[PDB]
Scaffold this active site. Structure first.
Site, PDB file in Angstrom:
ATOM      1  N   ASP A  18      -5.457  20.741   1.233  1.00  0.00           N
ATOM      2  CA  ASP A  18      -4.181  20.083   1.615  1.00  0.00           C
ATOM      3  C   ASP A  18      -3.426  19.651   0.365  1.00  0.00           C
ATOM      4  OD1 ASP A  18      -2.266  19.817   3.606  1.00  0.00           O
ATOM      5  OD2 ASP A  18      -2.879  17.666   3.979  1.00  0.00           O
ATOM      6  N   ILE A  76      -2.694   0.065   2.644  1.00  0.00           N
ATOM      7  CA  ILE A  76      -1.722   0.882   1.855  1.00  0.00           C
ATOM      8  C   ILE A  76      -1.722   2.318   2.367  1.00  0.00           C
ATOM      9  CG2 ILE A  76      -1.765  -0.634  -0.144  1.00  0.00           C
ATOM     10  CD1 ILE A  76      -3.736   1.330  -1.450  1.00  0.00           C
ATOM     11  N   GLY A  98      -9.454   7.437   8.962  1.00  0.00           N
ATOM     12  CA  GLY A  98      -9.765   6.136   8.337  1.00  0.00           C
ATOM     13  C   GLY A  98      -8.545   5.469   7.729  1.00  0.00           C
ATOM     14  N   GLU A  99      -8.776   4.467   6.873  1.00  0.00           N
ATOM     15  CA  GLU A  99      -7.736   3.561   6.331  1.00  0.00           C
ATOM     16  C   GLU A  99      -8.023   3.270   4.857  1.00  0.00           C
ATOM     17  OE1 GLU A  99      -8.065   0.305   9.135  1.00  0.00           O
ATOM     18  OE2 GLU A  99      -7.865   1.811  10.701  1.00  0.00           O
ATOM     19  N   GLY A 102      -3.174   4.993   6.078  1.00  0.00           N
ATOM     20  CA  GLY A 102      -3.770   5.021   7.421  1.00  0.00           C
ATOM     21  C   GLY A 102      -3.567   6.355   8.096  1.00  0.00           C
TER      22      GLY A 102
HETATM   23  C1  LIG Z   1     -13.341   9.524  -2.028  1.00  0.00           C
HETATM   24  C2  LIG Z   1     -11.985   9.222  -1.428  1.00  0.00           C
HETATM   25  C3  LIG Z   1     -10.910  10.236  -1.769  1.00  0.00           C
HETATM   26  O1  LIG Z   1     -11.170  11.440  -1.019  1.00  0.00           O
HETATM   27  C4  LIG Z   1      -9.580   9.685  -1.376  1.00  0.00           C
HETATM   28  C5  LIG Z   1      -8.528   9.272  -0.983  1.00  0.00           C
HETATM   29  C6  LIG Z   1      -7.242   8.793  -0.546  1.00  0.00           C
HETATM   30  C7  LIG Z   1      -6.749   9.182   0.708  1.00  0.00           C
HETATM   31  C8  LIG Z   1      -5.563   8.655   1.194  1.00  0.00           C
HETATM   32  C9  LIG Z   1      -4.849   7.756   0.403  1.00  0.00           C
HETATM   33  N1  LIG Z   1      -3.643   7.116   0.664  1.00  0.00           N
HETATM   34  C10 LIG Z   1      -3.293   6.324  -0.422  1.00  0.00           C
HETATM   35  C11 LIG Z   1      -4.288   6.454  -1.423  1.00  0.00           C
HETATM   36  C12 LIG Z   1      -5.299   7.372  -0.874  1.00  0.00           C
HETATM   37  C13 LIG Z   1      -6.514   7.894  -1.344  1.00  0.00           C
HETATM   38  C14 LIG Z   1      -4.424   5.869  -2.800  1.00  0.00           C
HETATM   39  N2  LIG Z   1      -5.620   5.950  -3.403  1.00  0.00           N
HETATM   40  C15 LIG Z   1      -5.727   5.413  -4.640  1.00  0.00           C
HETATM   41  N3  LIG Z   1      -6.885   5.579  -5.278  1.00  0.00           N
HETATM   42  N4  LIG Z   1      -4.743   4.783  -5.308  1.00  0.00           N
HETATM   43  C16 LIG Z   1      -3.572   4.721  -4.675  1.00  0.00           C
HETATM   44  C17 LIG Z   1      -3.324   5.265  -3.436  1.00  0.00           C
HETATM   45  C18 LIG Z   1      -1.916   5.257  -2.892  1.00  0.00           C
HETATM   46  C19 LIG Z   1      -1.785   4.568  -1.563  1.00  0.00           C
HETATM   47  C20 LIG Z   1      -2.028   5.520  -0.387  1.00  0.00           C
HETATM   48  C21 LIG Z   1     -10.929  10.587  -3.258  1.00  0.00           C
HETATM   49  C22 LIG Z   1      -9.641  11.107  -3.799  1.00  0.00           C
END
Ligand SMILES: CCC(O)(C#Cc1ccc2[nH]c3c(c2c1)-c1nc(N)ncc1CCC3)CC
EC number: 2.7.11.1
Length: 293
Positions: free
Chosen positions: A134, A20, A26-27, A22
């Site tokens: 950011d 979901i 990381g991913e 990338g």
């Molecule tokens: C400890 C990891 C953290 O730093 C992080 C992230 C993150 C980065 C890039 C991301 N990109 C996405 C998500 C996402 C989360 C995401 N995440 C969660 N929890 N639901 C939905 C989505 C939406 C889908 C895309 C904490 C906030």
């Protein structure tokens, strides 16, 4: 070249459904929790990756547990192929929700109430000694449960930095710090490759809320970092507020006054949003723009 294939099972519990998100560092996967039977977000980092950032992201997420606008921490681990964190899955991000609106604009009611939630989350990460660095609409996502669908969550601590030492003092700023974040919502301080502070996160909030209410920023067609910085440096920022509530001048003037060392007046900025709502009879329980109501 994906770190985990579909149906890959992490720690005999989290089953990969799909990727979901990338990028370089990381991913993110949607996975099924084979114990609690809900779906979760599974974020992974290659074990080999030179810049190991996920460990810092997890430390920040753990410090924020118990605060509002914070994903629940479920688990984390390290092995010979990848590092991972499991967290609460969230829903639609604010950039996609804004593009889905007819003129790419939110009502002032949606804009001000989102502003209150984003400001709370920014004060929260600052309160545990970190800058986000950011802040942008795509890094905030609405909930996906009956208990959370009107709650906005802060995502992606990948570019975060601790601004305090081990003993809670403000760290010395570097004379030059390479800004590596998103161009459109970056402060003039970030454009100048100056050490970022708490005020720079609030600059990003300011630009976001103008874009939400007005549907655009003056520099949106310009992708080059240097050009955008030169446009922002001269731009009469009061002009951004022509069609915004007059209270927003107090917000602009406050963050314009801040430097790297100075703690922001978060309550002053909260009062701008709350007074702007009260002036216009906007209630907290109102429909968001994207809801049937
Ligand atoms: C400890 C990891 C953290 O730093 C992080 C992230 C993150 C980065 C890039 C991301 N990109 C996405 C998500 C996402 C989360 C995401 N995440 C969660 N929890 N639901 C939905 C989505 C939406 C889908 C895309 C904490 C906030």
């Amino acid at each position: 070249a994906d770190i985990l294939p579909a149906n890959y099972v992490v720690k005999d519990r989290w089953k990969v459904l799909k990727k979901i998100g990338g990028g370089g560092f990381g991913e993110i996967y949607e996975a099924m929790d084979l114990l609690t039977r809900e779906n979760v977000a599974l974020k992974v980092e290659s074990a080999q990756q030179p810049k190991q950032v996920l460990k810092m992201e997890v430390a920040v997420l753990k410090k924020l547990q118990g605060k509002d606008h914070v994903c629940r921490f479920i688990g984390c681990g390290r092995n010979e192929k990848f590092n991972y964190v499991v967290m609460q899955l969230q829903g639609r991000n604010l950039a996609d929700l804004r593009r889905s609106q007819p003129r790419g604009t939110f009502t002032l009611s949606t804009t001000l109430r989102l502003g209150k939630q984003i400001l709370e989350s920014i004060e929260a990460i600052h309160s545990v000694g970190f800058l986000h660095r950011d802040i942008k609409p795509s890094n905030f996502a609405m909930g996906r449960l009956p208990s959370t669908y009107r709650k906005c969550y802060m995502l992606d601590f990948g570019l975060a930095r601790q601004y305090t030492n081990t003993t809670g003092d403000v760290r010395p700023p570097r004379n030059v710090a390479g800004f590596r974040g998103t161009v459109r919502y970056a402060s003039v301080n970030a454009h100048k490759n100056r050490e970022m502070g708490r005020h720079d996160d609030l600059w990003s909030l300011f630009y976001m809320l103008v874009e939400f209410a007005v549907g655009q920023l003056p520099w949106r067609k310009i992708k080059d970092k240097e050009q955008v910085g030169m446009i922002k440096e001269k731009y009469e920022h009061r002009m951004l507020l022509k069609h915004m509530p007059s209270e927003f001048h107090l917000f602009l003037d406050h963050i314009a006054s801040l430097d790297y060392f100075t703690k922001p007046d978060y309550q002053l900025i909260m009062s701008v949003f709350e007074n702007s709502m009260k002036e216009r009879g906007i209630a907290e329980n109102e429909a968001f723009d994207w809801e049937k109501a």
